[PDB]
Design a binder for this molecule. Sequence first.
Ligand SMILES: *[C@@H]1O[C@H](CO)[C@@H](O[C@@H]2O[C@H](CO)[C@@H](O[C@@H]3O[C@H](CO[C@H]4O[C@H](CO)[C@@H](O)[C@H](O)[C@@H]4O)[C@@H](O)[C@H](O[C@H]4O[C@H](CO)[C@@H](O)[C@H](O)[C@@H]4O)[C@@H]3O)[C@H](O)[C@H]2NC(C)=O)[C@H](O)[C@H]1NC(C)=O
Ligand SMILES: *[C@@H]1O[C@H](CO[C@@H]2O[C@@H](C)[C@@H](O)[C@@H](O)[C@@H]2O)[C@@H](O[C@@H]2O[C@H](CO)[C@@H](O)[C@H](O)[C@H]2NC(C)=O)[C@H](O)[C@H]1NC(C)=O
Ligand SMILES: *[C@@H]1O[C@H](CO[C@@H]2O[C@@H](C)[C@@H](O)[C@@H](O)[C@@H]2O)[C@@H](O[C@@H]2O[C@H](CO)[C@@H](O)[C@H](O)[C@H]2NC(C)=O)[C@H](O)[C@H]1NC(C)=O
Ligand SMILES: *[C@@H]1O[C@H](CO[C@@H]2O[C@@H](C)[C@@H](O)[C@@H](O)[C@@H]2O)[C@@H](O)[C@H](O)[C@H]1NC(C)=O
Ligand SMILES: Nc1ncnc2c1ncn2[C@@H]1O[C@H](COP(=O)(O)O)[C@@H](O)[C@H]1O
Ligand SMILES: [Zn+2]
Ligand SMILES: [Zn+2]
Length: 426
Amino acid sequence: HKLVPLAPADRAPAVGQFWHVTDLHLDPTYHITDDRTKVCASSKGANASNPGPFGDVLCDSPYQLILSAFDFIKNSGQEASFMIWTGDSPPHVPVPELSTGTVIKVITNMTMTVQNLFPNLQVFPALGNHDYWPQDQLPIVTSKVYSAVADLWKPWLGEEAISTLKKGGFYSQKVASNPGLRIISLNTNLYYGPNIMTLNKTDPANQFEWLENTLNSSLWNKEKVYIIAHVPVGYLPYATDTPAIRQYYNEKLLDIFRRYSSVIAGQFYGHTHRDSLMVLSDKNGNPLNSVFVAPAVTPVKGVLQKETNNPGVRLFQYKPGDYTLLDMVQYYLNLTEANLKGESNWTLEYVLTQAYSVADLQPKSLYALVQQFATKDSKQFLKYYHYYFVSYDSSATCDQHCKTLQVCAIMNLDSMSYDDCLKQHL
Ligand SMILES: *[C@@H]1O[C@H](CO)[C@@H](O[C@@H]2O[C@H](CO)[C@@H](O[C@@H]3O[C@H](CO[C@H]4O[C@H](CO)[C@@H](O)[C@H](O)[C@@H]4O)[C@@H](O)[C@H](O[C@H]4O[C@H](CO)[C@@H](O)[C@H](O)[C@@H]4O)[C@@H]3O)[C@H](O)[C@H]2NC(C)=O)[C@H](O)[C@H]1NC(C)=O
Ligand SMILES: *[C@@H]1O[C@H](CO[C@@H]2O[C@@H](C)[C@@H](O)[C@@H](O)[C@@H]2O)[C@@H](O[C@@H]2O[C@H](CO)[C@@H](O)[C@H](O)[C@H]2NC(C)=O)[C@H](O)[C@H]1NC(C)=O
Ligand SMILES: *[C@@H]1O[C@H](CO[C@@H]2O[C@@H](C)[C@@H](O)[C@@H](O)[C@@H]2O)[C@@H](O[C@@H]2O[C@H](CO)[C@@H](O)[C@H](O)[C@H]2NC(C)=O)[C@H](O)[C@H]1NC(C)=O
Ligand SMILES: *[C@@H]1O[C@H](CO[C@@H]2O[C@@H](C)[C@@H](O)[C@@H](O)[C@@H]2O)[C@@H](O)[C@H](O)[C@H]1NC(C)=O
Ligand SMILES: Nc1ncnc2c1ncn2[C@@H]1O[C@H](COP(=O)(O)O)[C@@H](O)[C@H]1O
Ligand SMILES: [Zn+2]
Ligand SMILES: [Zn+2]
């Protein structure tokens, strides 16, 4: 007779789950036609290679592909308490073939697709470099795009997040279903090489100052943080000595992340359209923070590229009320198979703990895994390189130089450690 909360069973609490989708790149022009240079504007006059209803390797996403990805999520039987969505919705076409209004229209379409299919799911979006017109030129003051996405994403975001989103394209937001968890959605396009608007800016849109204060508040309020953004920190794994964002910004952002590694329980990026791991470590090689780059829904590649990705979406598992990452489940569409029969079969690619025989996704667990990658003829690394393209080509090979670039980028996010890795292993 005392109105005490009803104690749950001693059963093990169910893990929490959330979805990560990225790089949808809708191409509204997509359509099958005899002249394969007219299947999709995103091929920029190239002949589509083998187009079907779910797309082509030289095209961005037909609407039907994006719909099939979200239909899979909806009917997967996986419970999830939120979704993160890390940007890049318009297609790869020349700047004169887009406009601010067209960019906003595509982002609106994607946003409304998600809200229509998932009316009860909190979603945390981030802007990508194509989520602006002209592409990559994301500004350091308020803009029409920033104001538009602030209105589009209002169902998911509180007043303070809406205010910072409108001003600079970034926000933080408490997760309604997960007390003690905060999402920080950065606009890392402010740091991306092609962005003229941020040249010679030490703190464009004051995002570093804001991020510092946000993380400090989370620290003192005993919150955990998941960082989400479009362009990742660290080095491109397919190129030599090339940071994904400008080196000055990479170094500055990584130092913030190292100082707050005790608060940051995950980092989640897109932009590369590949499945990549990174482990942020100190200068002495001690692992600090696990980083997850998710592959795209679009399969697009340029004619000059040999490989591309299969479409992917992924799910993370975490410890409830604690937010330590326990696992990652990567799903994919075999695009050639789907196009041949005309029906999608989104399916499991792998479960990270099972694929790699690791206990969880903590930095030390992943650090020990990637140390195995470095061993000669590592079967773990061969599997990783297969999954890098989302199982596009089991015959794709990574020679000694390719593997040095991959492993060095996985383990060394800052310039000093990355260049030392090249010195030791080239
Ligand atoms: C996603 O879905 C696609 C489509 O089903 C799968 O791709 C097919 O995979 C099978 C098996 O790997 C391929 O069949 C094999 O092809 C080999 C030839 O390689 C290429 O050569 C021709 C050029 O002449 C290409 O056009 C062709 O597409 C291939 O890419 C052959 O050497 C094999 O022959 C022998 O294989 C075994 C031997 O035990 C036997 O089954 C056969 O009888 C034969 O003796 C075999 O035919 C098939 O070609 C692929 N199709 C396409 C369109 O690429 C992907 O594997 C799948 N992805 C994942 C991750 O599962
Ligand atoms: C796009 O492709 C067309 C068609 O090329 C053919 O189509 C394929 C199915 C395959 O069979 C190829 O080997 C063929 O060549 C190209 O147009 C043709 O190109 C050659 C001359 O270079 C010749 O077949 C015809 O003169 C061209 N026209 C047609 C209707 O066949 C076209 O050049 C390709 N465009 C690009 C940008 O690659
Ligand atoms: C989202 O778009 C799809 C795809 O259509 C294109 O995408 C938009 C960005 C915009 O440019 C549209 O004008 C394009 O047609 C829409 O699906 C299509 O909708 C129309 C009906 O209005 C219909 O003619 C098509 O057959 C539909 N299907 C396909 C595969 O194109 C979809 O309705 C849009 N969704 C939202 C919520 O806006
Ligand atoms: C980080 O915050 C420290 C703690 O100060 C208190 O933090 C919360 C509760 C705020 O309400 C603030 O007003 C409090 O004073 C600061 O002492 C410290 O300066 C901050 N560190 C940095 C690097 O900004
Ligand atoms: N694996 C790759 N090889 C060569 N170029 C790439 C690769 N991945 C991405 N790019 C380039 O990076 C950009 C793609 O990012 P985005 O345009 O934001 O989707 C384009 O300029 C591509 O040409
Ligand atoms: Zn992209
Ligand atoms: Zn991008």
